[PDB]
Each structure stands twice: as C-alpha cells, then as structure tokens.
C-alpha cells in the first residue's frame, strides 16, 4: 500500500514518529505486511479547502484490494484521527482518495505484482 | 472536488488570489458548493513536457460525478484558460487528468461520502 | 503519457540528463512521440518504504492505452533500472502506479483527447 498526505501544515509541526505511526497503523488496518507499506508526507503546501487556508490535507491511499465501503470508512476514521491528533487538522478539512489497484497495474522490483501470466 | 496543479513556474509567478479564483471558478463549473472545493498549487517543480522545460503544468481534477466527455472539454477550456492567463503557461503544454470518484472511495470527516449502507 | 517520480533522494543526486533520458526512454517504451511525453521528478521528499527512510521512490505512469500486463512489466524493468542506475534506489523500494486513462478523461490544449 501507498499513503500520501499533502498539507499546508509546516514541516516543523510534523512530530517525531509520524511516518512510523502511519506505517504501522496502516499495516494493521489493511492487513498488509508493514514491509510493503509506503508513506509520504508533504508539508508546507500552497492549498485551500473551501477557499480557506486554515490547516487542511489532501491524501491518497492505494492498495491492491482491501478497498471498499466499510473498509474505507474505517481507514478514514483512523487517518483523520491521526491527522487531527498529530497535525491538528480538522477531519472536515481532509479528503482521502482511495484507489483499488489491480496487481497488474502496480510496478515493483523490476516487474509488477502480476506474476501469473 | 479536488484540483491539483503541478508546475515549473516560480512561486512568485503565482498571483495572490489564484487559489480563490480556482475555487470559485470550479464551484461554478461543477455545480458543487465552494465549501467542498479543494485546490492545491505546487510551483517550482522539476519537470519537462515534450523534452522542454518551458512553462508547463500537470494537473488533476477529482470529482464525485460531474465528470464526462463534454463536461471535461468544458473544464479543459476553463482551466487551460486560467493557467494561460494567470501563470503564462501555453495550453498545449498542459495535461489535466480527470477522475470520476465513487462516493465510497472518498474519505472525509472521519468517514466517506458513502453514508447510506453498511 | 506522463511519468511522475517522488523520492527522498536529495536533488543534488539527480544527474544532469535525467529528465531527458526519461522522456526519450518512455517515448520508446510506450511507442508515443516524445513531444507528448511529460516527466516530473520530485526529490528531497519525506517518505518511508517498509518503515525505512533509505532511498525509495513512489511513481506513477499515466497513458491513454499502452497499459497492460506485459507492457507494465516492461515499463517497470526500464524505470526501476533507471532509478537504480541514476538515483541509486533499490528496485524493491520502488512502487509505480500505472493508469490506463480514457481519452475523454485527459485534457490538453483547451480540449480533451476525445
């Protein structure tokens, strides 16, 4: 899985431990091994939510499977919770785009995750 | 909706009020309320288009619905026009990827926009 | 086509010629003319792969067609090869998301490719 957060929150406000907390909690939430979890945090961004430049975040989560109605709501509760607690961003100023990736459409280690045919 | 612009144009070349103009114009174009429009501009990027590092932009528009052939043609005229006028980027050096998002695949406010079923 | 690479490798470690090599090699790999290839490199990123901040890369390739099983494996061998040779990133610390874009969902030059 791949999780990206873009935010106008300053880099200085990103707490020690944040990438690791995201890695571990996403490994657990998605059921994928932590060795395969990638996280990417992009602070100090020029962005607005609703025309306001108060703290906000635009995120994406890509996973091969484990994407769907109830699962995505659980991911959103988890991730908004972390963004609120760690970055002081209001949950109603976060968007997370979820992508259910086909294994053939993910590159890794000189090939893809479609190794069957 | 979510609109992202990635460009090699300098930050100083991004006019004050650009994010607000994008918000208002996108609210008007999509019919979605401005309170729900998110805009993101990323200047000073290391990029090339056609092998050239002249001004260019790589953009995305995500929306739950309001995405389609004719609408996307309209969005493209609108957005290329704004990037040309405000950032001085030529329309033939802009790519805009459109994404029609399912409500269940957009997180917001501790949940998603799929609030109807369990 | 458009190719984006986000990496925690420092900007100074990106070699002269890198954007041009990507442009030209993707033009060849995808069969599309180089004048329509867009490339975007974002160094100095705060990221981790498997909980480690050793060199890694998160990438995307968007194309109208020319996306599929065998083709994507070929793109990945090409791109991981370039990332290893040029940026010293291990192939097993690279993810590349491939997107087969509908022509109606790609805007360019005031209209779309549809």
Swiss-Prot record, chain B:
PROSITE patterns in UniProt: MIF
UniProt KW Secreted keyword: yes
Keyword Isomerase annotated: yes
Xref: SUPFAM superfamilies: Tautomerase/MIF (SSF55331)
Residues holding substrate: 32, 64, 97
Disorder association: Rheumatoid arthritis systemic juvenile: An inflammatory articular disorder with systemic onset beginning before the age of 16. It represents a subgroup of juvenile arthritis associated with severe extraarticular features and occasionally fatal complications. During active phases of the disorder, patients display a typical daily spiking fever, an evanescent macular rash, lymphadenopathy, hepatosplenomegaly, serositis, myalgia and arthritis.
PANTHER family linked: D-DOPACHROME DECARBOXYLASE (PTHR11954), MACROPHAGE MIGRATION INHIBITORY FACTOR (PTHR11954:SF6)
Subunit structure: Homotrimer. Interacts with CXCR2 extracellular domain. Interacts with the CD74 extracellular domain, USO1, COPS5 and BNIPL.
Protein name: Macrophage migration inhibitory factor
Organism, scientific name: Homo sapiens (Human)
């Amino acid at each position: 899985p791949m999780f990206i957060v873009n935010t106008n929150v300053p880099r200085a406000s990103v707490p020690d431990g944040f990438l690791s907390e995201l890695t571990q909690q996403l490994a657990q939430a998605t059921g994928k091994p932590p060795q395969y979890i990638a996280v990417h945090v992009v602070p100090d961004q020029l962005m607005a939510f609703g025309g306001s430049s108060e703290p906000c975040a635009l995120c994406s989560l890509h996973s091969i499977g484990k994407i769907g109605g109830a699962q995505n709501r659980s991911y959103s509760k988890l991730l908004c919770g972390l963004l609120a607690e760690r970055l002081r961003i209001s949950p109603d100023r976060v968007y997370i785009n979820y992508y259910d990736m086909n294994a053939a459409n993910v590159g890794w280690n000189n090939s893809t995750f479609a190794l069957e045919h």
